[PDB]
Write a protein that binds this DNA or RNA. Sequence first.
DNA 1: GTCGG
DNA 2: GCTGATGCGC
DNA 3: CCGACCGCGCATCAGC
Length: 326
Amino acid sequence: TLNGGITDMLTELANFEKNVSQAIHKYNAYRKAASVIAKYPHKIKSGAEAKKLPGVGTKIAEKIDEFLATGKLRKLEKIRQDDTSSSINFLTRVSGIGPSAARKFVDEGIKTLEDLRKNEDKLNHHQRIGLKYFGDFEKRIPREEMLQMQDIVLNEVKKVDSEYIATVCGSFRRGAESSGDMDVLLTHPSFTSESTKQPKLLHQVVEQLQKVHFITDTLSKGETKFMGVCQLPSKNDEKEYPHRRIDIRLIPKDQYYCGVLYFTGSDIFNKNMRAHALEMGFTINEYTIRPLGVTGVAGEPLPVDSEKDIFDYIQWKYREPKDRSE
DNA sequence: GTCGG
DNA sequence: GCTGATGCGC
DNA sequence: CCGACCGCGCATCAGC
Ligand SMILES: Nc1nc2c(ncn2[C@H]2C[C@H](O)[C@@H](COP(=O)(O)OP(=O)(O)OP(=O)(O)O)O2)c(=O)[nH]1
Ligand SMILES: [Cl-]
Ligand SMILES: [Cl-]
Ligand SMILES: [Mg+2]
Ligand code: NA
Ligand code: NA
Ligand code: NA
């Protein structure tokens, strides 16, 4: 946690622009800056020194100068005093409440945690489960718990059919010692970019995991993306574990390396990598990397047979998952 | 809010 | 219903 | 200056 004071200021600035200002590029600006400063391996002693790194420009320069002087930023201090923005920031912490839902609720007087309980009638389903497990969803997961969760998922999956492969990605695959949640990549060989030979492929998995009582709730569920809740099982009169967020993404088996790249992340790394593809003249998503025509239209999928092939198309040296934390 | 063209 | 735009979350 | 800023799944709503 080297430059943590500066980086928390920028993350607090980014959350403001995102939740209150509804200014998604200001959000990404502060996020990039916070990311570049967090990877920089000295103690920033001046706003100008930070201005050297890309994505730290003039206005973040003044803000670093001030933070280094006072230990505060008064733009922030006053954002924290404003009760409209502080109520908006808080409501967005409920999964399913975004910036728009937050401001609407505040316009209706629903401002606090007890307000939300009074009015579970005015919530959609995702918002309800987000409120239900509001505290749990804010706890991290130690890696050790991730390892037991991995074992259940990989052993339950093997039972539905032995040809399912299931890869835990996200921060776990990047080597984190604690995780915000669990992210699971799922391949079955009967689902490729050329056919879906069997339906319910993802539904069977969600079904099996529900019946061992691992999956406990559902936020959203289509035929390739599940978004819900799980909980490790406890011993005899041991305290229950917190409930955990789990996403499971069924990707066509022949598109595994683009899928595993996407789900390993991080979100910022993905953004920077996909942006660099575009300046090199490629477009990357979770399925394919394609060349861009002389006009804008994306071409046809380039053949990929490892993660490193994707890095090589855009002329980056490969980076291990644990070096993709940005 | 930053940056590259 | 279907299509598309938006919110929200990755 | 000034526009472009990753890309997409699912839930939901408007409009036909
Ligand atoms: N292309 C893209 N991918 C994203 C974005 N957000 C998340 N992802 C991908 C990369 C993440 O590593 C992965 C899982 O999303 P998470 O929110 O769980 O992030 P991650 O697991 O890295 O962090 P965590 O420790 O769980 O909070 O999904 C995004 O805005 N764009
Ligand atoms: Cl691939
Ligand atoms: Cl594609
Ligand atoms: Mg995660
Ligand atoms: Na800079
Ligand atoms: Na939210
Ligand atoms: Na996730």
